[PDB]
Amino acid sequence: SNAMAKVKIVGILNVTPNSFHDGGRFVETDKAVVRARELLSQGADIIEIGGESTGPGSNTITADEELARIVPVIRAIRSSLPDANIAVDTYKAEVARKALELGATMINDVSAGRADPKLFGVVARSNAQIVLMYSKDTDPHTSFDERQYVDVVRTVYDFLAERKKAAMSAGIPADRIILDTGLGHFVSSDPQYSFQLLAHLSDFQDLGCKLFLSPSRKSFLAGNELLKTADRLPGTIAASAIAVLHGADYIRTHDVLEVRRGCEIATAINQPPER
Amino acid sequence: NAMAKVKIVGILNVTPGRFVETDKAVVRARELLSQGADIIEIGGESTGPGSNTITADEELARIVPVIRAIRSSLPDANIAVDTYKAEVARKALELGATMINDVSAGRADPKLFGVVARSNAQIVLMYSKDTDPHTSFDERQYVDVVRTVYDFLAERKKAAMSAGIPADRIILDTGLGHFVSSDPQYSFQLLAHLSDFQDLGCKLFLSPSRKSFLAGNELLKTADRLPGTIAASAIAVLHGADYIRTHDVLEVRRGCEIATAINQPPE
Ligand SMILES: [Cl-]
Ligand SMILES: [K+]
């Protein structure tokens, strides 16, 4: 029949220790597992585990520290929740390699394969999907910068087409390549460009890949009131629903319950009558 | 011998119909005073990242009814106005404000210094990395942020005095957060070396006030920045701050009292 599939909701699971010094890792691992269960309980389809933040102001960490953070978490989830689908947010080949050996089935590379020349190969030799994100910066840690564009849609489309080609040349087929236009500071600290990408998201379907976006209480949702993170849930729901309406196949979020429910409405609007 | 406590400046933002704002504004003003604020700083125009310009008429429409309401209901309240517009400062001073905080340090409106010169009010000159009063998201780097900010404040104090404002009515703010840089390290460096600014001979005013430079390694959002704000505000006082601007009057006043006590020499 003509049934439109629901969007896949990607729950964000960031593993960041509280204590700066050594010790207290079992406690942090246990906390991450509890959060993973809650994400699944709220209806997340994929749990995206990351040990290194890449938003503005974020610190770079070594592959060893990154693995020390996520490995115990991945192992605990795969062991107790084997039904759960795990994605790993990393730009390092060594980290991706280990994550894939442990059962992760998706790698989300904020640098679209530019940070580590070996990452595409690692993904190619697995059956994992790769999410290629557009970023205005070469460095995987994005900057606060009010970048301007003549036409952001063209710039991002051209970048994603080139990264898709590069991934395919490295051995990853098109059916395992997912594209993310980026939103917020990854695109620009000037919010207009994020809204323009959302308006024209359907144009990206021509690249022949599933689409992944993360409005997720980002900067661009501040609006006229200059709303801070705590007040951006309605805007996050609206932007995520509109993204689904315009073609998003995956929505990444910290607010699984609410964003899943808002996106269900977008899917229902896109659902043609059963006749 | 007894060192005076810092003056706490309570933030009262009047940024959104119109009339539904004033009784609520008076209620908040009363609460700021109840918590121990010495000055109520009314601001009708946001100047943080992503903000846009509002007209002088719109700014006046926002703040004037609030100033009038506070003067009437809370006559003992000292009022400051956060504005870069001469026309707005002029009206605020006529109505009783005794302090004008200019995020542009007199650069945005060539007539603002003259307006303040022709009053008995104090002016707060803040350092901003941008010429436009609405600050940008920009990870501005510096070879020596303390030297850059010090020289900027010196030049601005000189301009204020040239316009007719005496040194005893000039207050300096190094800026913190995005005004200095979207890279947090520079805000911490200014707090470390705040005592160096005492050489300019003016009282010092700072506003850590839950700014994003306080996010730290955990990338803490606003709701979780109170401990950092308390620590930063207390260290600012320890290092020479005469005024601390905040939304959290009670807690910041109490934390700052500890810094004052640490600065109190023995008997
Ligand atoms: Cl420099
Ligand atoms: K303001």
Coordinates of C-alpha atoms and ligand atoms in Angstrom, one line a residue:
Chain A
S1 CA 0.0 0.0 0.0
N2 CA 0.9 3.7 0.1
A3 CA 1.9 3.8 3.8
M4 CA 4.5 6.5 4.6
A5 CA 7.2 5.3 7.0
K6 CA 7.7 7.1 10.2
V7 CA 10.9 9.1 10.8
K8 CA 13.7 7.4 12.7
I9 CA 14.3 9.3 16.0
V10 CA 18.0 9.4 17.1
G11 CA 18.4 9.9 20.8
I12 CA 21.5 11.8 21.9
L13 CA 23.7 10.0 24.5
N14 CA 26.7 12.2 25.3
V15 CA 29.2 10.5 27.7
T16 CA 31.1 13.3 29.6
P17 CA 32.8 12.6 32.9
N18 CA 32.1 15.0 35.8
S19 CA 35.3 14.4 37.6
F20 CA 38.3 15.8 35.6
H21 CA 40.7 13.3 37.4
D22 CA 40.8 9.5 37.2
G23 CA 38.2 7.3 39.0
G24 CA 34.4 7.3 39.0
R25 CA 34.1 5.8 35.5
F26 CA 31.8 2.8 36.5
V27 CA 29.3 5.4 37.9
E28 CA 29.4 7.5 34.7
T29 CA 29.0 4.3 32.6
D30 CA 25.9 3.3 34.8
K31 CA 24.4 6.8 34.3
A32 CA 24.8 6.5 30.5
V33 CA 23.1 3.1 30.5
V34 CA 20.1 4.5 32.6
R35 CA 19.8 7.4 30.1
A36 CA 20.0 4.9 27.1
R37 CA 17.0 3.0 28.6
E38 CA 15.0 6.2 29.0
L39 CA 15.7 7.2 25.4
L40 CA 14.4 3.8 24.3
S41 CA 11.4 4.1 26.6
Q42 CA 10.5 7.4 25.0
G43 CA 10.6 5.8 21.5
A44 CA 14.1 6.4 20.1
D45 CA 15.0 4.2 17.2
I46 CA 18.7 4.7 17.4
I47 CA 20.9 5.7 20.4
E48 CA 23.8 8.0 19.2
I49 CA 26.7 7.6 21.6
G50 CA 29.4 10.3 21.6
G51 CA 32.4 10.8 23.8
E52 CA 33.6 14.1 22.2
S53 CA 31.4 17.2 21.9
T54 CA 31.9 19.1 18.6
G55 CA 29.7 22.1 19.1
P56 CA 31.3 25.6 19.6
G57 CA 33.5 25.9 22.7
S58 CA 34.0 22.1 22.9
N59 CA 37.4 20.6 23.8
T60 CA 39.3 18.1 21.6
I61 CA 40.1 14.7 23.3
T62 CA 42.4 11.9 22.3
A63 CA 41.2 8.7 20.7
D64 CA 42.2 6.9 23.9
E65 CA 40.1 9.1 26.2
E66 CA 37.2 8.9 23.6
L67 CA 37.4 5.1 23.6
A68 CA 37.7 5.1 27.4
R69 CA 34.4 7.0 27.6
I70 CA 32.3 5.2 25.0
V71 CA 33.6 1.6 25.0
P72 CA 32.2 0.6 28.4
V73 CA 28.8 2.3 27.5
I74 CA 28.6 0.5 24.1
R75 CA 29.5 -2.8 25.7
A76 CA 26.9 -2.4 28.5
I77 CA 24.1 -1.5 26.1
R78 CA 24.8 -4.2 23.6
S79 CA 24.9 -6.7 26.5
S80 CA 21.7 -5.7 28.3
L81 CA 19.8 -4.1 25.4
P82 CA 20.9 -6.2 22.4
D83 CA 17.8 -5.1 20.4
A84 CA 19.0 -1.4 20.5
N85 CA 20.5 0.1 17.4
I86 CA 23.7 2.1 18.2
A87 CA 25.3 4.9 16.3
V88 CA 28.6 6.5 17.2
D89 CA 29.3 10.2 16.8
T90 CA 33.1 10.3 16.0
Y91 CA 35.4 11.7 13.3
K92 CA 38.3 9.4 14.3
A93 CA 39.0 6.1 12.3
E94 CA 40.4 4.2 15.3
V95 CA 37.2 5.1 17.4
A96 CA 34.9 4.1 14.5
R97 CA 36.8 0.9 14.0
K98 CA 36.4 -0.2 17.6
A99 CA 32.8 1.0 17.7
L100 CA 31.9 -1.1 14.6
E101 CA 33.6 -4.2 16.2
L102 CA 31.4 -3.8 19.2
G103 CA 28.2 -3.7 17.2
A104 CA 27.5 -0.1 16.2
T105 CA 25.7 0.1 12.9
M106 CA 26.1 3.8 12.1
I107 CA 28.9 6.3 12.3
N108 CA 28.1 10.1 12.3
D109 CA 31.2 12.1 11.1
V110 CA 30.9 15.8 11.7
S111 CA 33.8 16.3 9.3
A112 CA 32.2 14.2 6.5
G113 CA 35.4 12.1 6.2
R114 CA 37.8 15.0 6.1
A115 CA 39.3 14.8 9.6
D116 CA 40.7 11.3 9.3
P117 CA 41.5 9.9 5.8
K118 CA 41.2 6.3 7.1
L119 CA 37.6 6.6 8.4
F120 CA 35.8 6.0 5.1
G121 CA 37.8 2.8 4.6
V122 CA 36.9 1.6 8.1
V123 CA 33.2 2.2 7.4
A124 CA 33.5 0.7 3.9
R125 CA 34.7 -2.7 5.3
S126 CA 31.7 -2.9 7.7
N127 CA 28.1 -2.7 6.6
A128 CA 27.5 0.4 8.7
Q129 CA 25.8 3.5 7.5
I130 CA 27.7 6.8 7.6
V131 CA 26.2 10.2 8.2
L132 CA 28.1 12.9 6.3
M133 CA 27.4 16.4 7.9
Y134 CA 28.1 19.7 6.2
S135 CA 30.3 22.0 8.4
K136 CA 31.5 25.5 7.5
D137 CA 34.8 24.6 9.2
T138 CA 37.5 22.2 8.3
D139 CA 38.3 21.5 12.0
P140 CA 35.6 19.0 13.4
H141 CA 35.0 21.3 16.4
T142 CA 32.8 24.1 14.9
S143 CA 33.4 27.8 15.6
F144 CA 31.1 30.7 16.6
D145 CA 31.2 32.7 13.3
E146 CA 28.5 34.6 11.5
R147 CA 29.4 33.1 8.2
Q148 CA 27.5 34.6 5.2
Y149 CA 26.6 32.8 1.9
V150 CA 25.5 34.0 -1.5
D151 CA 23.3 30.8 -1.5
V152 CA 23.8 28.5 1.4
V153 CA 21.6 25.8 -0.3
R154 CA 23.9 25.6 -3.3
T155 CA 27.1 25.7 -1.1
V156 CA 25.8 22.8 1.1
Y157 CA 24.4 20.8 -1.8
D158 CA 27.7 21.0 -3.7
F159 CA 29.7 20.0 -0.6
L160 CA 27.5 17.0 0.2
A161 CA 27.6 15.9 -3.5
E162 CA 31.4 16.0 -3.3
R163 CA 31.6 14.1 0.0
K164 CA 29.1 11.5 -1.2
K165 CA 31.4 11.0 -4.3
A166 CA 34.5 10.7 -2.0
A167 CA 32.7 8.2 0.3
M168 CA 31.7 6.1 -2.8
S169 CA 35.3 6.2 -4.2
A170 CA 36.5 4.8 -0.8
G171 CA 34.1 1.8 -1.1
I172 CA 30.9 2.9 0.7
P173 CA 27.8 2.4 -1.5
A174 CA 25.2 5.1 -1.9
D175 CA 22.6 3.1 0.0
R176 CA 24.8 3.4 3.2
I177 CA 25.4 7.1 2.8
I178 CA 23.2 9.5 4.9
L179 CA 23.5 13.3 4.4
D180 CA 23.0 16.0 7.0
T181 CA 23.0 19.6 5.8
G182 CA 24.1 20.8 9.3
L183 CA 22.1 23.3 11.3
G184 CA 23.0 26.1 13.7
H185 CA 26.6 27.1 14.2
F186 CA 27.8 24.2 11.9
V187 CA 26.2 26.3 9.0
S188 CA 26.5 29.7 10.5
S189 CA 26.1 31.7 13.8
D190 CA 23.7 33.8 11.6
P191 CA 20.4 31.9 12.0
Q192 CA 18.9 32.8 8.6
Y193 CA 20.9 30.1 6.8
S194 CA 19.5 27.3 9.0
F195 CA 16.0 28.3 8.1
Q196 CA 16.8 28.4 4.4
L197 CA 18.2 24.9 4.5
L198 CA 15.0 23.7 6.2
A199 CA 12.9 25.6 3.6
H200 CA 14.7 23.8 0.8
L201 CA 15.5 20.5 2.3
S202 CA 13.5 18.7 -0.4
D203 CA 16.1 19.9 -3.0
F204 CA 18.6 17.6 -1.3
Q205 CA 16.6 14.5 -2.1
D206 CA 18.1 14.7 -5.6
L207 CA 21.4 13.4 -4.2
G208 CA 19.7 10.0 -3.7
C209 CA 20.5 9.5 0.0
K210 CA 18.4 9.4 3.2
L211 CA 18.5 12.8 5.1
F212 CA 19.4 13.3 8.7
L213 CA 18.9 16.6 10.6
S214 CA 19.3 17.8 14.2
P215 CA 17.4 21.0 15.1
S216 CA 17.8 20.0 18.7
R217 CA 17.5 23.3 20.6
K218 CA 20.3 24.8 18.5
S219 CA 21.2 28.5 18.4
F220 CA 19.2 29.3 15.3
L221 CA 16.0 28.6 17.3
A222 CA 16.6 31.6 19.5
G223 CA 14.2 33.7 17.5
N224 CA 13.2 37.3 18.2
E225 CA 13.0 36.7 22.0
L226 CA 16.7 35.4 22.0
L227 CA 15.5 32.3 23.7
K228 CA 18.0 30.2 25.5
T229 CA 18.3 26.4 25.4
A230 CA 15.7 25.8 28.1
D231 CA 13.0 27.7 26.1
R232 CA 13.7 26.2 22.6
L233 CA 11.5 23.0 22.8
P234 CA 8.6 24.4 20.9
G235 CA 10.9 25.7 18.1
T236 CA 12.7 22.3 18.1
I237 CA 9.3 20.5 17.7
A238 CA 8.3 22.9 14.9
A239 CA 11.6 22.7 13.0
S240 CA 11.8 18.9 13.4
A241 CA 8.3 18.4 12.2
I242 CA 8.9 20.7 9.2
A243 CA 12.1 18.8 8.4
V244 CA 10.2 15.6 8.3
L245 CA 7.5 17.2 6.1
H246 CA 10.3 18.3 3.7
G247 CA 12.1 14.9 3.6
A248 CA 14.0 14.1 6.7
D249 CA 14.4 10.4 7.3
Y250 CA 16.2 10.8 10.7
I251 CA 15.7 13.4 13.4
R252 CA 18.4 13.7 16.2
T253 CA 17.2 15.1 19.5
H254 CA 17.6 15.3 23.3
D255 CA 13.8 15.5 23.6
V256 CA 12.7 12.1 22.2
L257 CA 9.2 11.9 23.6
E258 CA 8.1 15.3 22.4
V259 CA 9.9 15.4 19.1
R260 CA 8.8 11.9 18.2
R261 CA 5.2 13.0 18.8
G262 CA 5.5 16.2 16.8
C263 CA 7.2 14.3 13.9
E264 CA 4.3 11.8 13.9
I265 CA 2.0 14.6 13.0
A266 CA 4.2 15.6 10.1
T267 CA 4.3 12.0 8.8
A268 CA 0.4 11.9 9.1
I269 CA 0.1 15.1 7.1
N270 CA 2.3 13.5 4.4
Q271 CA 0.3 10.3 4.5
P272 CA -2.1 10.2 1.4
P273 CA -5.5 8.8 2.0
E274 CA -5.6 5.0 2.1
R275 CA -8.1 5.6 -0.9
Chain B
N1 CA 40.0 50.6 57.8
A2 CA 36.7 48.7 57.0
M3 CA 36.4 47.9 53.3
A4 CA 33.0 48.6 51.7
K5 CA 31.0 45.9 50.2
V6 CA 30.3 45.7 46.5
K7 CA 27.2 47.4 45.1
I8 CA 24.9 44.8 43.6
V9 CA 23.2 45.9 40.4
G10 CA 20.0 43.9 39.8
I11 CA 19.1 43.3 36.2
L12 CA 15.5 44.3 35.1
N13 CA 15.1 43.6 31.4
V14 CA 12.1 45.1 29.7
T15 CA 12.2 43.3 26.4
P16 CA 9.0 41.5 25.2
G17 CA 1.1 44.1 25.8
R18 CA 2.7 47.3 27.2
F19 CA 0.7 47.8 30.4
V20 CA 0.9 44.1 31.4
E21 CA 4.6 44.7 31.8
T22 CA 4.7 47.6 34.4
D23 CA 3.0 46.0 37.5
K24 CA 5.1 42.9 36.9
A25 CA 8.2 45.0 36.5
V26 CA 7.5 46.7 39.8
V27 CA 7.0 43.3 41.4
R28 CA 10.4 42.1 40.1
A29 CA 12.1 45.4 41.1
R30 CA 10.7 45.0 44.7
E31 CA 12.1 41.4 44.8
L32 CA 15.6 42.6 43.6
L33 CA 15.6 45.2 46.4
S34 CA 14.3 42.6 48.9
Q35 CA 17.2 40.4 47.9
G36 CA 19.7 43.3 48.6
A37 CA 20.2 45.0 45.2
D38 CA 21.6 48.5 45.5
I39 CA 20.7 49.6 42.0
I40 CA 18.0 48.4 39.6
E41 CA 19.4 48.5 36.0
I42 CA 16.5 48.8 33.5
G43 CA 17.3 47.8 29.9
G44 CA 14.9 48.0 27.0
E45 CA 17.2 46.7 24.3
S46 CA 19.0 43.4 24.1
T47 CA 22.7 43.7 22.9
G48 CA 23.8 40.0 23.2
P49 CA 24.6 37.8 20.1
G50 CA 21.7 37.5 17.7
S51 CA 20.2 40.8 18.8
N52 CA 19.0 43.5 16.5
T53 CA 18.5 47.2 16.7
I54 CA 15.3 48.7 18.1
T55 CA 14.3 52.4 17.5
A56 CA 14.7 55.0 20.2
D57 CA 10.8 55.3 20.2
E58 CA 10.4 51.6 20.9
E59 CA 13.1 51.6 23.6
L60 CA 11.4 54.6 25.3
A61 CA 8.0 52.9 25.0
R62 CA 9.4 49.9 26.9
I63 CA 11.4 51.7 29.6
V64 CA 9.6 54.9 30.4
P65 CA 6.4 53.4 31.9
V66 CA 8.6 51.1 34.0
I67 CA 10.8 54.0 35.3
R68 CA 7.7 56.0 36.2
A69 CA 6.1 53.0 37.9
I70 CA 9.3 52.3 40.0
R71 CA 9.8 56.0 40.9
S72 CA 6.2 56.1 42.1
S73 CA 6.0 52.7 44.0
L74 CA 9.6 52.3 45.1
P75 CA 10.9 55.9 45.6
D76 CA 14.0 54.8 47.5
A77 CA 15.3 52.7 44.5
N78 CA 18.4 53.8 42.7
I79 CA 17.9 53.4 38.9
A80 CA 20.4 52.8 36.2
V81 CA 19.5 52.5 32.5
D82 CA 21.3 50.2 30.0
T83 CA 21.2 52.2 26.8
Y84 CA 23.6 53.4 24.0
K85 CA 21.1 56.1 22.7
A86 CA 21.5 59.7 23.8
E87 CA 17.7 60.4 23.5
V88 CA 16.9 57.5 25.8
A89 CA 19.6 58.4 28.3
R90 CA 18.3 62.0 28.3
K91 CA 14.8 61.0 29.2
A92 CA 16.0 58.4 31.8
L93 CA 18.1 61.1 33.5
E94 CA 15.2 63.6 33.6
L95 CA 13.1 60.9 35.2
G96 CA 15.6 60.2 38.0
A97 CA 18.1 57.6 36.7
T98 CA 21.6 58.1 38.2
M99 CA 23.6 55.8 36.1
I100 CA 23.8 55.1 32.3
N101 CA 25.4 51.9 31.2
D102 CA 26.6 52.2 27.6
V103 CA 27.6 48.9 26.0
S104 CA 29.3 50.9 23.2
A105 CA 31.4 53.1 25.6
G106 CA 30.0 56.3 23.9
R107 CA 30.8 55.2 20.4
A108 CA 27.3 54.3 19.1
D109 CA 25.7 57.7 19.6
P110 CA 28.0 60.8 19.3
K111 CA 25.6 62.8 21.5
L112 CA 25.5 60.4 24.5
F113 CA 28.6 61.7 26.3
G114 CA 27.2 65.2 26.2
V115 CA 23.9 64.1 27.6
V116 CA 25.6 62.5 30.6
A117 CA 28.1 65.4 30.9
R118 CA 25.0 67.6 31.5
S119 CA 23.8 65.6 34.4
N120 CA 25.1 64.3 37.8
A121 CA 24.9 60.7 36.7
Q122 CA 27.6 58.2 36.4
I123 CA 28.4 56.5 33.1
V124 CA 29.6 52.9 32.7
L125 CA 31.9 52.4 29.7
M126 CA 32.2 48.8 28.7
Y127 CA 34.7 47.2 26.4
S128 CA 33.2 45.4 23.3
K129 CA 35.2 43.8 20.5
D130 CA 32.6 45.1 18.1
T131 CA 31.8 48.7 16.9
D132 CA 28.1 47.9 16.7
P133 CA 26.5 47.7 20.1
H134 CA 24.8 44.4 19.3
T135 CA 27.7 42.0 19.8
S136 CA 28.6 39.2 17.4
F137 CA 29.2 35.5 17.7
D138 CA 32.9 35.5 17.0
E139 CA 35.8 33.6 18.6
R140 CA 38.0 36.6 18.6
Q141 CA 41.5 35.8 19.6
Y142 CA 44.0 38.2 21.3
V143 CA 47.8 38.3 21.8
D144 CA 47.1 40.1 25.2
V145 CA 43.5 40.7 25.9
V146 CA 44.3 42.6 29.1
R147 CA 46.5 45.2 27.2
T148 CA 43.9 45.5 24.5
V149 CA 41.0 46.1 26.9
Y150 CA 43.1 48.4 29.2
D151 CA 44.2 50.6 26.3
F152 CA 40.6 50.7 24.9
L153 CA 39.2 51.8 28.3
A154 CA 41.9 54.3 28.8
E155 CA 41.1 55.9 25.4
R156 CA 37.4 55.9 26.1
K157 CA 37.9 57.5 29.6
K158 CA 39.9 60.1 27.8
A159 CA 37.0 60.8 25.3
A160 CA 34.4 60.9 28.1
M161 CA 36.5 63.4 30.0
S162 CA 37.0 65.5 26.8
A163 CA 33.2 65.6 26.5
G164 CA 32.9 67.0 30.0
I165 CA 32.3 63.9 32.2
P166 CA 34.7 64.0 35.2
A167 CA 36.7 60.9 36.2
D168 CA 34.8 60.6 39.5
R169 CA 31.6 59.9 37.4
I170 CA 33.3 57.4 35.0
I171 CA 32.9 53.6 35.7
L172 CA 34.8 51.0 33.6
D173 CA 33.6 47.5 32.7
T174 CA 36.1 45.2 30.9
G175 CA 33.3 43.3 29.4
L176 CA 32.8 39.6 29.8
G177 CA 31.5 36.8 27.6
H178 CA 30.7 37.4 24.0
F179 CA 31.5 41.1 24.3
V180 CA 35.1 40.1 24.8
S181 CA 35.1 37.0 22.7
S182 CA 33.0 33.9 22.1
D183 CA 36.2 32.1 23.2
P184 CA 35.8 31.9 27.0
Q185 CA 39.5 32.0 27.9
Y186 CA 39.7 35.8 27.5
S187 CA 36.9 36.4 30.1
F188 CA 38.9 34.3 32.6
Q189 CA 42.1 36.2 31.8
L190 CA 40.4 39.6 32.4
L191 CA 39.1 38.3 35.8
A192 CA 42.6 37.1 36.7
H193 CA 44.1 40.5 36.0
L194 CA 41.2 42.8 37.0
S195 CA 43.4 44.5 39.6
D196 CA 45.6 45.9 36.8
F197 CA 42.6 48.1 35.7
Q198 CA 42.6 49.9 39.1
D199 CA 45.5 52.1 37.7
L200 CA 42.9 53.9 35.5
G201 CA 41.5 55.5 38.6
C202 CA 37.9 54.6 38.1
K203 CA 35.4 52.3 39.9
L204 CA 35.1 48.9 38.2
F205 CA 31.8 47.2 37.1
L206 CA 31.5 43.6 35.9
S207 CA 28.7 41.2 35.0
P208 CA 29.6 37.5 35.0
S209 CA 25.8 36.9 35.3
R210 CA 25.3 33.4 33.9
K211 CA 27.1 34.2 30.6
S212 CA 28.2 31.3 28.4
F213 CA 31.9 31.7 29.2
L214 CA 30.8 30.0 32.4
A215 CA 29.6 26.8 30.5
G216 CA 32.9 25.0 31.3
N217 CA 33.8 21.4 30.3
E218 CA 30.2 20.2 31.0
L219 CA 28.7 22.8 28.5
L220 CA 26.4 23.9 31.2
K221 CA 23.2 25.8 30.2
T222 CA 21.9 28.9 31.9
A223 CA 20.0 27.1 34.7
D224 CA 23.2 25.4 35.8
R225 CA 25.6 28.4 35.8
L226 CA 24.8 29.8 39.3
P227 CA 27.8 28.3 41.0
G228 CA 30.1 29.6 38.3
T229 CA 28.5 33.0 38.5
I230 CA 29.0 33.1 42.3
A231 CA 32.6 32.1 41.9
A232 CA 33.4 34.5 39.1
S233 CA 31.5 37.4 40.8
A234 CA 33.3 36.8 44.1
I235 CA 36.8 36.6 42.5
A236 CA 35.9 39.8 40.5
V237 CA 35.2 41.6 43.9
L238 CA 38.4 40.1 45.4
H239 CA 40.3 41.6 42.4
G240 CA 38.7 45.1 42.6
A241 CA 35.1 45.1 41.3
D242 CA 33.0 47.9 42.9
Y243 CA 29.8 46.8 41.2
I244 CA 28.5 43.4 40.3
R245 CA 25.6 43.1 37.9
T246 CA 23.4 40.0 38.2
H247 CA 20.0 38.3 37.9
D248 CA 20.7 36.4 41.1
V249 CA 21.0 39.1 43.7
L250 CA 20.6 37.1 46.9
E251 CA 23.2 34.5 46.1
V252 CA 25.7 36.7 44.4
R253 CA 25.4 39.3 47.2
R254 CA 26.1 36.6 49.7
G255 CA 29.1 35.2 47.8
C256 CA 30.5 38.6 47.2
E257 CA 30.3 39.4 51.0
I258 CA 32.7 36.5 51.5
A259 CA 35.2 38.1 49.0
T260 CA 34.9 41.4 50.8
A261 CA 35.6 39.7 54.1
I262 CA 38.7 38.0 52.6
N263 CA 39.9 41.5 51.5
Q264 CA 39.4 42.9 55.0
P265 CA 42.8 43.4 56.7
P266 CA 43.1 42.6 60.4
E267 CA 42.7 44.8 63.5
Ligands
CL1 CL 45.8 40.9 18.9
K2 K 20.4 45.1 27.7

